[PDB]
């Protein structure tokens, strides 16, 4: 009914191991880029 | 004549010197950062952008100055 059974599960493990490496790494790429905004300080200095 | 005058008028800082405290300059950390003062009521924008340079002593200020000369400077009253 499902011959590919073994292959999908073999690929699924590789997918999980890939995502386990990739997901924290892309998040780290995002955070560092976003950090310029995430630590930005505002100050309002109106005149007089 | 200058050395004569220097001894004539500046000599008077002898006696004793530096016997309690001496100050030498500490290095100053450069930070790659941004300051943006947004004022939409002034007609022209001023922007100054810089990397960290090496300091007075460094032989490679010459090559920097040359590279700066190439880029140079412009102003609306230049005829070129
Ligand atoms: C065009 C756009 C396509 C670019 C895709 C960009 C990649 C997206 C990153 C997402 C991470 C995916 C998880 C990684 C899993 C993967 O590594 O597992 C390997 C595993 C193979 O293992 P084996 O059977 O042992 O290999 C035998 C031969 N060595 O492959 C996986 O099944 C494939 C992963 C599917 C990711 C889905 C990506 C979505 C894009 C689909 C569009 C496809 C376009 C291709 C058409 C090109 C025209 C010629």
Curated annotation (Swiss-Prot), chain A:
Coiled coil segments of this chain: none
Signal peptide span: none
Highest taxon of the lineage: Eukaryota
Mitochondrial matrix compartment segments: 39-48
Places the protein is found: Mitochondrion inner membrane
Ranges that cross the membrane: 5-38
Family of the protein in this entry: Belongs to the cytochrome c family.
Protein role: Component of the ubiquinol-cytochrome c oxidoreductase, a multisubunit transmembrane complex that is part of the mitochondrial electron transport chain which drives oxidative phosphorylation.
Quaternary assembly: Component of the ubiquinol-cytochrome c oxidoreductase (cytochrome b-c1 complex, complex III, CIII), a multisubunit enzyme composed of 11 subunits. The complex is composed of 3 respiratory subunits cytochrome b, cytochrome c1 and Rieske protein UQCRFS1, 2 core protein subunits UQCRC1/QCR1 and UQCRC2/QCR2, and 6 low-molecular weight protein subunits UQCRH/QCR6, UQCRB/QCR7, UQCRQ/QCR8, UQCR10/QCR9, UQCR11/QCR10 and subunit 9, the cleavage product of Rieske protein UQCRFS1.
Protein name: Cytochrome c1, heme protein, mitochondrial
Organism per entry: Bos taurus (Bovine)
Gene transcribed to yield this protein: CYC1
Span of the entire protein shown here: 278 to 325 of 325
Curated annotation (Swiss-Prot), chain B:
Superkingdom assignment: Eukaryota
Residues annotated with N6-acetyllysine modification: 8
Location within or outside the cell: Mitochondrion inner membrane
General function of this protein: Component of the ubiquinol-cytochrome c oxidoreductase, a multisubunit transmembrane complex that is part of the mitochondrial electron transport chain which drives oxidative phosphorylation.
Family per similarity comment: Belongs to the peptidase M16 family. UQCRC1/QCR1 subfamily.
Subunit structure: Component of the ubiquinol-cytochrome c oxidoreductase (cytochrome b-c1 complex, complex III, CIII), a multisubunit enzyme composed of 11 subunits. The complex is composed of 3 respiratory subunits cytochrome b, cytochrome c1 and Rieske protein UQCRFS1, 2 core protein subunits UQCRC1/QCR1 and UQCRC2/QCR2, and 6 low-molecular weight protein subunits UQCRH/QCR6, UQCRB/QCR7, UQCRQ/QCR8, UQCR10/QCR9, UQCR11/QCR10 and subunit 9, the cleavage product of Rieske protein UQCRFS1.
Record protein name field: Cytochrome b-c1 complex subunit 1, mitochondrial
Organism field: Bos taurus (Bovine)
Biological classification of the source: Eukaryota, Metazoa, Chordata, Craniata, Vertebrata
Span within the parent record: 241 to 320 of 480
């Amino acid at each position: 009914a499902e011959p590919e059974h073994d292959h999908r599960k073999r690929m699924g493990l590789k997918m999980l191991l890939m995502m386990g490496l990739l997901l924290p790494l892309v998040y780290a790429m995002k955070r560092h880029k976003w950090s310029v905004l995430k630590s930005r300080k505002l100050a309002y200095r109106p005149p007089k | 004549q200058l050395l004569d005058l220097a001894q004539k008028h500046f000599s008077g800082l002898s006696g004793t010197y530096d016997e309690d405290a001496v100050p030498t300059l500490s290095p100053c950390r450069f930070t790659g950062s941004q300051i943006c003062h947004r004022e939409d009521g002034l007609p022209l924008a001023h922007v100054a952008i810089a990397v960290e340079g090496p300091g007075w002593a460094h032989p490679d200020n010459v090559a920097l100055q040359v590279a700066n000369a190439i880029i140079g400077h412009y102003d609306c009253t230049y005829g070129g």
